[PDB]
Amino acid sequence: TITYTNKVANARLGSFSSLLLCWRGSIYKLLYGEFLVFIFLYYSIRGLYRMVLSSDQQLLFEKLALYCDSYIQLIPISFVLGFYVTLVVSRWWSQYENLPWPDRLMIQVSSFVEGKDEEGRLLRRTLIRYAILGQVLILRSISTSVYKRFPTLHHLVLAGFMTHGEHKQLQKLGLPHNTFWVPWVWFANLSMKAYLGGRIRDTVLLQSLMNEVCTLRTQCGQLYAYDWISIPLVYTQVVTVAVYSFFLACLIGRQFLNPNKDYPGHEMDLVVPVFTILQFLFYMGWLKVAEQLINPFGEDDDDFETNWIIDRNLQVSLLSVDGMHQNLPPMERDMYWNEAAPQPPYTAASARSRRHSFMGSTFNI
Amino acid sequence: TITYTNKVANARLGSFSSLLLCWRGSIYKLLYGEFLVFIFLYYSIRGLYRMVLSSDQQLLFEKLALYCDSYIQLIPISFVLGFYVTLVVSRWWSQYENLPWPDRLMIQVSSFVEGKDEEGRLLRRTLIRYAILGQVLILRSISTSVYKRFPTLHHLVLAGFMTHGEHKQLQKLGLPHNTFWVPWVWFANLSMKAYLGGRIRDTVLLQSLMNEVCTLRTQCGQLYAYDWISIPLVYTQVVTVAVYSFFLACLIGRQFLNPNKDYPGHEMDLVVPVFTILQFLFYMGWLKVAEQLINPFGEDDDDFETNWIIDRNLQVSLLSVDGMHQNLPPMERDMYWNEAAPQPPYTAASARSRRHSFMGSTFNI
Amino acid sequence: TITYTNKVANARLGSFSSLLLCWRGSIYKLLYGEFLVFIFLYYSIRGLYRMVLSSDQQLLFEKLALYCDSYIQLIPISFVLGFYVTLVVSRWWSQYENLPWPDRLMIQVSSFVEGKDEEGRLLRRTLIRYAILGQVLILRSISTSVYKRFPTLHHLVLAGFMTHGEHKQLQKLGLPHNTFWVPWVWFANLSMKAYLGGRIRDTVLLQSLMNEVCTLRTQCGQLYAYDWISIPLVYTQVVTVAVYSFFLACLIGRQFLNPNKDYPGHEMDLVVPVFTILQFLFYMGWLKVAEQLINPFGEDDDDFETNWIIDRNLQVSLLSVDGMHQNLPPMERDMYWNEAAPQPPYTAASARSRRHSFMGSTFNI
Amino acid sequence: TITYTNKVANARLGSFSSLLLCWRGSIYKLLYGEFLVFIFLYYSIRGLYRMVLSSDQQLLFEKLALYCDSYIQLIPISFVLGFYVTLVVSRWWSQYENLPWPDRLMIQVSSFVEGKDEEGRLLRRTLIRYAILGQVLILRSISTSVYKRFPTLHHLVLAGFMTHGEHKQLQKLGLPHNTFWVPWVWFANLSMKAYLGGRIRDTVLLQSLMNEVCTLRTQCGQLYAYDWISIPLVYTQVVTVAVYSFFLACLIGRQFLNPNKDYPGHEMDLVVPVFTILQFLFYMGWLKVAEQLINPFGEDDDDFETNWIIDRNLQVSLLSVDGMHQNLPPMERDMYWNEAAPQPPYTAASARSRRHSFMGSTFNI
Amino acid sequence: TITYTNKVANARLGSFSSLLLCWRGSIYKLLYGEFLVFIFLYYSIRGLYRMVLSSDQQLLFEKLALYCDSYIQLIPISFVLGFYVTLVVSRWWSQYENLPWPDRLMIQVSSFVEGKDEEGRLLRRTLIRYAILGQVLILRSISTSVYKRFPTLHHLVLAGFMTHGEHKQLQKLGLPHNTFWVPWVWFANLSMKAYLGGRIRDTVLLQSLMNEVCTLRTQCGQLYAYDWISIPLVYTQVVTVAVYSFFLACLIGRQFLNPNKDYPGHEMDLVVPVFTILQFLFYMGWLKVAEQLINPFGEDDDDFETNWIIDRNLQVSLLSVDGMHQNLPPMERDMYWNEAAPQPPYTAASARSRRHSFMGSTFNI
Ligand SMILES: [Ca+2]
Ligand SMILES: [Ca+2]
Ligand SMILES: [Ca+2]
Ligand SMILES: [Ca+2]
Ligand SMILES: [Ca+2]
Ligand SMILES: [Cl-]
Ligand SMILES: [Cl-]
Ligand SMILES: [Cl-]
Ligand SMILES: [Cl-]
Ligand SMILES: [Cl-]
Ligand SMILES: [Cl-]
Ligand SMILES: [Cl-]
Ligand SMILES: [Cl-]
Ligand SMILES: [Cl-]
Ligand SMILES: [Cl-]
Structure with missing residues (x-):
């Protein structure tokens, strides 16, 4: 994408005139x-x-x-x-709103699933990998830049997103359909097996995890639907x-x-x-x-960079669920321990941003 | 539908001019x-x-x-x-947004309902069939291509979507209304019977299943309402x-x-x-x-293909809840087991998609 | 309403020209x-x-x-x-979206509330009547055709929607306001009394029932608000x-x-x-x-038929919660018991609707 | 507000022409x-x-x-x-959509919180007063007609919305901000004290009450935000x-x-x-x-009547949670006890509203 | 921002003409x-x-x-x-709708987490600080006036928003990405540690807290996305x-x-x-x-004052969760203890706002 937000922060004399030389x-x-x-x-x-x-x-x-x-x-x-370009723009934004991020799922996987040893680490890492795999599988079918990176399912095995056993099992389904729904079914069975065994404390937590997975499933389905059905050719040709x-x-x-x-x-x-x-x-x-x-997953200059979000997610999730579990900074008394109205200092360059609290529109009358 | 998304990925010289020869x-x-x-x-x-x-x-x-x-x-x-064709387009999209997919329901039915034998397999298969039956029943009353495929309720029995006993029971209601609400009531009673008997562990899981069913009921009702009430004839005749x-x-x-x-x-x-x-x-x-x-369930070239989604669903659901229960790939150590920052390789044809992480719009200042 | 959806399914030569002779x-x-x-x-x-x-x-x-x-x-x-007639149309559709249907409530009342005898049948029938009563009460204050049918609260007693005891109690409130909120408070107390006594198994199910009732309360309130506040007279007179x-x-x-x-x-x-x-x-x-x-609850030809939905609901709910409880068709093996890829047959008149599964927009490249 | 819905129910010859003489x-x-x-x-x-x-x-x-x-x-x-007047109208409607009504909260307070004596009545009445107090406090800061009615916080004590002890406690905070968030924090502590003591049966019910309170908090915050931030002066001056x-x-x-x-x-x-x-x-x-x-909380003729909804709520809530608890009409057999298809009678003046049930748009073909 | 709501309350002769001299x-x-x-x-x-x-x-x-x-x-x-300025205005409003407020979270932290001593006070204060830290971290990357106030992460330690231990730990991640997701992962681990130890009574309450945190995470992510992706330069240059x-x-x-x-x-x-x-x-x-x-987080006169909401939140949250826990005003009998229809008095200046209750639009007919 092209970012110019820092150049249009204020309405100065040449904020919009300087963008004509880009x-x-x-x-x-x-x-x-x-x-x-x-x-x-x-x-x-x-x-x-x-x-x-x-x-x-x-x-x-x-x-x-x-x-x-x-x-x-x-x-x-x-x-x-x-x-025409109001419908196109609304579709363009709704296509980004449906991008899956495992940020609400890595938190719960890190917290609820207990155990600090092997067979706990392995379980957490597998659970968090089964969602990134589904995201990669859906993105590979709609994004040209991602399909170029992973032209075949053996490239996923080479790149570490998959495993030999998973790749062998995924080929033994025999269905002539897209296979972007399979890791979501693997996740539920693995989570139930984890619960049966004392790694998840409560059925309440198990149901919370299932509810979190269903939302990602819905978002992936919406991305697939948007890619499948496009604006009618009669409307485009007019x-x-x-x-x-x-x-x-x-x-x-x-x-x-x-x-x-x-x-x-x-x-x-x-x-x-x-x-x-x-x-x-x-x-x-x-x-x-x-x-x-009309297709935000191409190779233009104003198209979504999908090759970077499948790299950030893989690192962030694996760091959150593996190396940051039960490891939190020391608990210490705050600066305003015995102060009822804390007053953080203002820097010299931002002293003009001080304002009084708003107290309703009828205060003066 | 007509799909031309692959032909308009990039804004080249003749992307939109080549669509005029279709x-x-x-x-x-x-x-x-x-x-x-x-x-x-x-x-x-x-x-x-x-x-x-x-x-x-x-x-x-x-x-x-x-x-x-x-x-x-x-x-x-x-x-x-x-x-006029902004209202028509919004209605056209909202009609697809309400298509029922049992994707969030097959997951929970496969996971929560336990037992690997007969009377567990039978129960799971019946539970997942009672939803596809309702979807077929609602679609048969609004889609011409589906009504042509199933002109009578005996054709459903012949095609395997129904059973002789269920067909006999559905005729003994005596109500002069559409019968697309009956399988949703059968589902709840069967699920309660399954819970009374130790096949469902918790009332929490039972309530989760009911909450999942109610959403499909709402979506089917919305499809029926959209079909029943159309854009006013005075607006169309103007x-x-x-x-x-x-x-x-x-x-x-x-x-x-x-x-x-x-x-x-x-x-x-x-x-x-x-x-x-x-x-x-x-x-x-x-x-x-x-x-x-104005009616997306006809036999045009830009009308929804409803005869394919009732064939994909029947296979996918029955494979998920029957042959894929408690059967998951082996658990193994990952490639980045002891690496904090995984770096998946980039192919030669996609080396231009490498980008640095965005770090806020105020970073440079 | 006027339904012409069957006449505009396909874009033929005279689909829109034949509607000018209506x-x-x-x-x-x-x-x-x-x-x-x-x-x-x-x-x-x-x-x-x-x-x-x-x-x-x-x-x-x-x-x-x-x-x-x-x-x-x-x-x-x-x-x-x-x-002006974009706001009018949006309001017209939102007014229909808020019509209460007890379809998500009859399911749960039939399932959760147990007991197959008297004092179970009576309890379920009363619970399902207390919601239809509230729907009738709200509709009587906004729909002319329903007010003509029930000009006084004794007509409700005569028609079976009410009871002598309930009618006597409702008159003993002494508040100069509309009384469309009272059955919703009767429902909660009756359901709590049912729970205290072993007819409802769990507080989880009780809370689910309360959550279902609150949505109908919100929808009735929205209908009342829409009727109370109309498009400003200055905007209409312009x-x-x-x-x-x-x-x-x-x-x-x-x-x-x-x-x-x-x-x-x-x-x-x-x-x-x-x-x-x-x-x-x-x-x-x-x-x-x-x-x-501008008022969809009149006596026009393109106004909602509210006298039919309060007749269908009364029959459907009372059949679901009374005669269809713990009564489901026999459980039998399916046609595709040992088939992994079911292939339902296609009729001769619908052989042109066969299509291949969509496999992503990057499949060809 | 001005209500003319009864005069425009049907599209007659002079429905819109007669509104020009108002x-x-x-x-x-x-x-x-x-x-x-x-x-x-x-x-x-x-x-x-x-x-x-x-x-x-x-x-x-x-x-x-x-x-x-x-x-x-x-x-x-x-x-x-x-x-300009599409944004103004949408803002005008969204401002009403955020008006707090304690209708989903009075139901649950009446049902869940048990005990029919003193210290149960007192607890329920205090719990229901702590929400009306917050609604009055937020409305007093944005509505001119309500500020005129309660020009000072002693007027609230005189009018019965407050108490001497609560008024003394609210002055001992020492924060230079609006105090419309304090009763919402009092509610949670009082509800937890009620639970610790056997008045609330389950943590499930306690969590339901907290979830209900959070929605009212969000709505009050939205009203405050709408009042604080207005349409930009540059857009208005154009x-x-x-x-x-x-x-x-x-x-x-x-x-x-x-x-x-x-x-x-x-x-x-x-x-x-x-x-x-x-x-x-x-x-x-x-x-x-x-x-x-542009400001729907003024003293115009088409501005919201906020002085009536803070009077209706105070009576309705206090009648629901105090005098209508565990007091429901007798349970009796219905009119259609042994009838499968009830047929309520039609009056003579509404015999033209009889219609057949809609059975799908594909029924005729 | 510029507030002129008090000057346009009524539609008088010179309400809009007097705003041209601003x-x-x-x-x-x-x-x-x-x-x-x-x-x-x-x-x-x-x-x-x-x-x-x-x-x-x-x-x-x-x-x-x-x-x-x-x-x-x-x-x-x-x-x-x-x-163009309908899309710009809608984006401007949606950017404010995603501002995080810990108003629904301080309530639950104050109520659910028990204990009135040290190690309870410390735990509650840390839990409420871990959310304000995340809000400050996300705002510092998009708001110029906040970046000027906190140009480096040592300024946060000096201002009391952070701690030496937390600042040392945050630097030991080694990921080249924005670190606005870390306090949200610290919160979950600290809350689970609090539950393991008897400070949180129920897994139901724990799940409620997690659900509340996930919404703030989503809102912060939406703010980051809005800042990252801007309106296309081709649309702006046209x-x-x-x-x-x-x-x-x-x-x-x-x-x-x-x-x-x-x-x-x-x-x-x-x-x-x-x-x-x-x-x-x-x-x-x-x-x-x-x-x-086009960028509401600048230093204009009609830009959001983000330096005041990060000062109000810090005081309000710390007063709610520390000094207002288990401290509520005395419970006393109300003014209308034995009155069924309370009638609060009307002031002399607001006697013209008295109105009768609306009783449906069909009452007169
Ligand atoms: Ca493109
Ligand atoms: Ca068509
Ligand atoms: Ca009408
Ligand atoms: Ca006004
Ligand atoms: Ca700006
Ligand atoms: Cl997220
Ligand atoms: Cl010519
Ligand atoms: Cl789905
Ligand atoms: Cl002429
Ligand atoms: Cl429904
Ligand atoms: Cl002239
Ligand atoms: Cl409500
Ligand atoms: Cl000139
Ligand atoms: Cl809030
Ligand atoms: Cl020229």
């Missing part, structure tokens, strides 16, 4: 190849009309250009563009025959005709259509928002 | 018969005006065409179209009068009149209305989005 | 009386201008009609209409002044003036304003959507 | 003082132009009026008005410099100039701007929706 | 530097055209100004502005090109040309563009809403 993941990079084609077509038509066409055909071209001018309307195109039948009209009709005929609209010849290039930029960078956000 | 489930297939009628009417009127009408009646037709030209406005038509009273005005008024009268607008005769055909495509493919999404 | 609950019935008034006023003014007015006053009328022609604008009227100050301008200004003055816009006299009648239909059927959905 | 809480009352100023300014300018100005200055005024006529545009003003720079242009520019100069637009002199007054009404009653809903 | 956090302060540049450029171009340019070049400038006048359109610019390519057209084209050429539009020379300055204000104060709300 190259990576911007308008100038996304619509660089669609501008050359437009310019080449425009100048080819201009040259053909200026020298190739004869005097009699010049009048026909002039009348055709006059005709192809009442069809340049900006309301219908600005409506589809804008009712916005690109609304923005491609507008610059086509512009090409023949936004042409500097001969100024000897004294038209009410055309009386000056500029070489470059400065006010048409700006319209092209504004009306194409709006469509390239949808063209980029 | 036939299955597209504009060219949906409005293929509504274009021939328009063309035939246009050309019939043109021929009649050109030869059938006399000189005196030509002036009347010309004045009528001039009159039928100030009523071609694009804002009121672009507002209803756009405030958008069909605003897009049919626009091409009617176009037919008489977007006609190439005689160029010997020297009108300010019409001075050239083209045979084919190229810029009217494009408007027709853009303004009719927008209405055919609603025309297609 | 009478019940449609435009032609909702704005039948508002069209006669408009036509009568238009023709009266036309006749007065054509014969009553003198030659000198004809010029004044002509100038007034010219003046009342620049105020016919379509954007401001199409904005309020469209930002859309009624924007659509009544537009046809008023149309009446004087969309008139076929004398064609002897050679105006740039008016040069032909048609008897009937065909393109004004269509505008009237389109701009009045849009307001009559809000006029119909 | 005075209380309407357009004519909200914008009564802004119309006199506009009329006075318009007529003063008209008189000055007609008599005070000389012949040479009349031409300058005429040219200025012509210039101030191309800036009367209706799209930019109809966009901000309409994107809509009122876009509707005040439109009637300013109207004042000089919608003036009936001298008809002796033969302008294409102005050729007739009417005394009163009938079509400008209507525009003023439509464009000012739209802004006065936001002006009224 | 300086702090307003239009005049936010766009003060962008107005001087525009004025300087306008007057420089005007002077150059009036004196520097020759007679022949004046005609070229005049024709260029005429050309740059058909590209001043208001619909495309009013659509992006308005579809609205900035559409409002900077409009005043550029205004500069050359909204110029008072020579009135000796008798143009249909320009016939008068005013020194100051009064109707262009207002347009600039309206169309730039709309963009400065997004420029200000």
